[PDB]
């Protein structure tokens, strides 16, 4: 019978009481009846749930750092989170399970990371895919009145794993189907609630089951999680990869994996760093590294077919010069510094989600009747930034050498060259003010200076967002001097030493410093 | 009886433990009861699903290219992809199987290309149409609580085909529904995940099922796919067909199968290159070949009824002059070059998904009060491009010999005479500038010159997209010399040889190079 299993499973109190009550209710029924299948199946579910079986969580931080650095590169803040968990777990047992949300663009290593933690903490990996899930019964099940009643994929995966310390990876929280017919994202408000998981009532089990030590790591692409559910999760925003990070990921983790998936032998293929960097500069324009391993896999695969169909060569070196012969023609390109100091042209810094880029900001000031025209598919905040720049110039028209009646005598065209790409933002206002102080004075803007900042009518420079990708975009070009806002100095502690050592980074307070540095002849 | 089926169709560990635990649960049930039917349904659904059966993937690359060239013409990049798959598969016993997204205009043969691939690789063929599909339970199914439940249609097709190495053809992956009520595109985000196909957990068969060797090939018409799905697929762009390869598809593939579909013998109907190229030039206006084979099929059935109703003429010969006797009035007309050098008009190069076309751009500069009107169903980037071009002419008007107060004294009207067709993009911008200079000087633009490129206020020419159909449109139109930007020289590496041989192609860097080449007199 079952009482050696119910006694053998050292349950908590109320689960043992309901389980034994269903046992002595089971031993008074006909065994070939349907009620014996309901109660018998209920006990057969109650015995499989891991009521107290645990997995021994690791304690060495150096070896766990070596596992996290073994499987992935560079994701420093999540590895810090796991080491802090293993430290506080190393001091006491039965901690609350950490509830995390990984938020980033596709390919930054959110789903593949959730197995590495399950090897670094010594937990057991388990994964639920929540993309497009609309049924709430995948989380809370049905009651056992119905015919085939099962306790939902949480209790099914706890019963399949067999311990009460797993690592649930919840893929695509932000892709759950929210509707009046189906909303399982609010059924998770009991599942991951940091002070209510100790009594998670299931609709099939009917007994409170402890989920407090289950480690919940969830992955999402955005912040469109409902705010009752987004508040319960410690959110780590995995930003996009840089070029040195994509280089080291591509040469420490992607080349051995794609050599192994294509069975490349030792002296058979050699892809150096210049070809990898040419893939990064010239063929891929993403934030992740999945199209990067597409191009690496295409290099290895074309090497396999060329060696199999040539039979005379036995070594292919792809050195970035013959990369064109394999991947095809160069798809994309990045922006570079100009080589000559020009009058109505400054170098702006822009940021998008795949990285940073340089902006050209061109002004033409023709003798006219005061018409102001702004082209380049500009947003409304950028147009307001040009109007603020013109107000700064018209307020300071005397001490800049500008004829103060140019608002009636000069037509001004402000154009940003890639007119097919939409652009919006408060930044590059000191850039547009610099390009308007020039071409009203004939002062050329020096070509090795990029700048970013938001301007006020008093002449101040306000902070901006994302200095790291902008300083990498300026370092990738021929920019040598970067004018940043003053209160963005607090970002300069998270910049690599190459960018700090190469760029001459000036923080500025007011527009007179910007015009003092970024003009060939002093404005004042 | 059932446990010999479980041990016969040998499973992995978790499927065997779940299925034998399910049968041991079935052993204490009455046979005619509802829970017994749910358990038996889960058991025979676990028995129909293949766990270990595969297919011998081919190894000969020459015969595989013979099959791929037997079914389709051209399409060298996808055929390269399939032969490279067969090379790596020839070296390795089991690899992950490619996830491909074929993207192109309709009629370019990406649905039939899948069955060509499944024939050329030895893999079994499975098709699933995703056009307009809104329910996410077509992919994952429902729990076995529900009455009449079953797995997703993917698991049903895997259980139908019997092997774990099929070719899935995901038809219309971009025409899937995506709203709050239905989102199967995020349900495909697990099954197209290149790392997590080893554990595909659907809702009926709640065991993990391995899909890390199924070849997924998806077909779509546009890049209107969610960015997580686009990142999980390998995009192959199938561009439109040229005149020579439509001639070769028609001669090598369309004419023999439309002869085969109409019982036309070898000595009844003959169609030469003049009729085929006349259909391509004057009846189709497409990117695919589907209206082309509709015109060919129309010729064949008219030939059939002309062989039945007459029965004294027994050989019909269709060529370039008697197509209107069968097909009728020419539906379309390609753009042609102009014959005289005319003040104010230029010929930009336009490109749509149907193909490249010539783009006449004209300007009138009448004496007035500086009015600026721009007609011709222009976009907003196009009108900003004309404003930038006019600023380049205006800041350079002393060098060009132009009276610099023309912004006060003369009214300028830029028009593109197609009218009803909407037109957008900066690629006409250089052309705009040239037209304005002509219409301010009386110096006519020579009609044998086309041009393309983006303009900046400095005067520089920036790169543009899609040179191949623009140069094919200039070669079709009778242009003898084009003007491309400088940094598009690389795209000249993938142009056919007759187009390079006929066109005098000049890359330009700035605007006075264009005004030096494209105008009749020196500026």
């Amino acid at each position: 019978a079952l009482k050696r299993k119910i006694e053998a499973a050292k349950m908590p109190k109320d689960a043992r009481e309901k389980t034994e009550a269903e046992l002595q209710k089971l031993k008074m029924m006909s065994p070939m009846s349907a009620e014996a299948t309901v109660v018998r199946g209920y006990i057969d579910w109650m015995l499989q749930v891991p009521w107290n079986s645990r997995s021994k969580v690791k304690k060495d931080l150096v070896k766990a750092q070596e596992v996290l650095d073994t499987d992935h590169y560079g994701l420093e803040r999540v590895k810090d989170r796991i080491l802090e968990y293993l430290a506080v777990q190393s001091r006491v047992s039965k901690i609350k399970g950490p509830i995390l949300c990984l938020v980033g663009p596709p390919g930054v290593g959110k789903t593949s990371l959730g197995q590495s933690i399950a090897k670094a903490t010594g937990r057991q990996y388990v994964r639920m895919a929540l993309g497009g899930v609309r049924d709430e019964a995948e989380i809370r099940g049905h009651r056992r009145t119905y015919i085939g009643s099962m306790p939902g994929k949480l209790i099914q995966k706890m019963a399949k794993v067999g311990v009460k310390n797993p690592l649930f990876l919840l893929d695509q929280i932000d892709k759950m189907a929210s509707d009046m017919r189906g909303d399982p994202a609010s059924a998770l408000l009991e599942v991951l609630d940091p002070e209510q998981n100790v009594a998670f009532n299931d609709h099939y089990l009917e007994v409170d089951y402890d989920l407090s030590d289950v480690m919940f790591v969830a992955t999402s692409n955005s912040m469109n999680i409902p705010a009752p559910l987004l508040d319960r999760m410690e959110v780590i925003r995995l930003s996009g990869y840089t070029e040195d990070e994509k280089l080291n990921i591509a040469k420490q983790h992607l080349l051995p994996k794609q050599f192994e998936r294509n069975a490349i032998k030792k002296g058979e293929l050699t892809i150096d760093d210049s070809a990898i960097m040419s893939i990064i500069r010239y063929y891929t324009r993403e934030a992740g590294v999945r199209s990067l391993e597409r191009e690496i896999s295409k290099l290895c695969r074309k090497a396999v077919k060329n060696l199999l169909m040539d039979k005379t060569v036995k070594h292919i070196e792809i050195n970035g010069d013959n990369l064109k012969d394999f991947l095809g023609v160069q798809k994309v390109d990045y922006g570079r510094a100009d080589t000559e100091n020009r009058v109505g042209q400054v170098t702006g810094l822009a940021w998008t989600e795949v990285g940073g880029d340089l902006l050209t900001i061109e002004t033409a000031c023709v003798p006219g009747k005061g018409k102001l025209t702004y082209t380049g598919s500009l947003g409304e905040v950028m147009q307001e930034s040009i109007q603020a720049a013109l107000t700064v110039v018209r307020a300071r028209a005397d001490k800049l050498g500008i004829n103060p009646d140019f608002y009636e005598k000069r037509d001004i065209h402000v154009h940003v060259p890639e007119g097919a790409t939409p652009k919006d933002g408060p930044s590059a206002g000191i850039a547009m003010c610099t390009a308007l102080v020039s071409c009203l004075t004939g002062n050329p803007v020096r070509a090795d200076v990029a700048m970013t900042g938001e301007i006020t009518l008093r002449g101040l420079v306000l902070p901006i967002g994302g200095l790291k990708e902008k300083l990498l975009a300026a370092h990738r070009g021929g920019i040598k001097v970067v004018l940043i806002p003053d209160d963005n100095k607090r970002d300069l502690e998270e910049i690599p030493d190459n960018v700090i050592a190469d760029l001459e980074i000036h923080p500025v307070k007011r527009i007179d410093d910007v015009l003092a540095i970024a003009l060939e002849h002093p404005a004042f | 009886a059932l446990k010999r089926k479980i041990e016969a169709a040998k499973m992995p560990k978790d499927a065997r433990e779940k299925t034998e635990a399910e049968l041991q649960k079935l052993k204490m049930m009455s046979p005619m009861s509802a829970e017994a039917t749910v358990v038996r349904g889960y058991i025979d659904w676990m028995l129909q699903v293949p766990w270990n059966s595969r297919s011998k993937v081919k190894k000969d690359l020459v015969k595989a290219q013979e099959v791929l060239d037997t079914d389709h013409y051209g399409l060298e990049r996808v055929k390269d992809r399939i032969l490279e798959y067969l090379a790596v598969q020839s070296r390795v016993s089991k690899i992950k199987g490619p996830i491909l997204c074929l993207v192109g205009p309709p009629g370019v043969g990406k649905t039939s290309l899948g069955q060509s691939i499944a024939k050329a690789t030895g893999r079994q063929y499975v098709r699933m149409a995703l056009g307009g599909v809104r329910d996410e339970a077509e992919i994952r199914g429902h729990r076995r609580t529900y009455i009449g439940s079953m797995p997703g249609k993917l698991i049903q097709k895997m259980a139908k085909v019997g092997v774990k190495n099929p070719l899935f053809l995901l038809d219309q992956i971009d025409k899937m529904a995506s709203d709050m009520r239905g989102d199967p595109a995020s349900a495909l985000l697990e099954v197209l995940d290149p790392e997590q196909n080893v554990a595909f957990n659907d809702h009926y068969l709640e065991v993990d099922y391995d899909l890390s060797d199924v070849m997924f090939v998806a077909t779509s018409n546009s890049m209107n796919i969610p960015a997580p799905l686009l990142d999980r697929m390998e995009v192959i762009r199938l561009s439109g067909y040229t005149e020579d390869e439509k001639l070769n598809i028609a001669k090598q593939h369309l004419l023999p199968k439309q002869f085969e579909r109409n019982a036309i013998k070898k000595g009844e109907l003959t169609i030469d290159d003049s009729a085929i190229m006349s259909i391509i030039r004057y009846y189709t206006r497409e990117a695919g070949v589907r209206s082309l084979e509709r015109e060919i099929s129309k010729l064949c059935r008219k030939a059939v009824k002309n062989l039945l109703m007459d029965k004294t003429v027994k050989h019909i010969e269709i060529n370039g002059d008697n197509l209107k006797d069968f097909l009728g009035v020419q539906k379309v007309d390609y753009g042609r070059a102009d014959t005289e050098n005319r003040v104010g008009q230029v010929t930009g190069l336009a490109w749509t998904e149907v193909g490249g076309d010539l783009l006449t751009i004209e300007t009138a500069c009448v004496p007035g009060k500086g009015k600026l009107t721009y007609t011709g169903s222009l976009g907003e980037v196009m009108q900003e491009s004309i404003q930038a071009a006019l600023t380049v002419v205006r800041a350079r008007a002393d060098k060009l010999g132009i009276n610099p107060d023309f912004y006060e004294k003369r009214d300028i009207h830029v028009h593109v005479p197609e009218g009803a067709t909407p037109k957008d993009g900066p690629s006409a911008g250089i052309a705009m500038c040239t037209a304005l200079v002509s219409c301010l000087t009386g110096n006519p633009v020579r009609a044998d010159v086309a041009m393309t490129g983006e303009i900046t206020l400095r005067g520089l020419v920036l790169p543009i997209g899609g040179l191949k159909e623009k140069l094919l449109a200039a070669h079709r139109g009778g242009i003898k010399v084009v003007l491309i930007p400088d940094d598009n020289k690389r795209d000249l590496e993938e142009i056919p040889d007759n187009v390079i041989a006929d066109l005098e192609i000049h890359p330009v860097k700035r605007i006075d190079d264009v005004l030096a080449i494209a105008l009749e007199h020196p500026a």
């Binding site: 009145t145 119905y146 015919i147 | 509802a34 609580t145 529900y146 009455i147």
Partner: peptide, 7 residues
């Protein structure tokens, strides 16, 4: 008599 949940 036994209840059964339909979708």
């Amino acid at each position: 008599a036994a209840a059964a949940a339909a979708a």
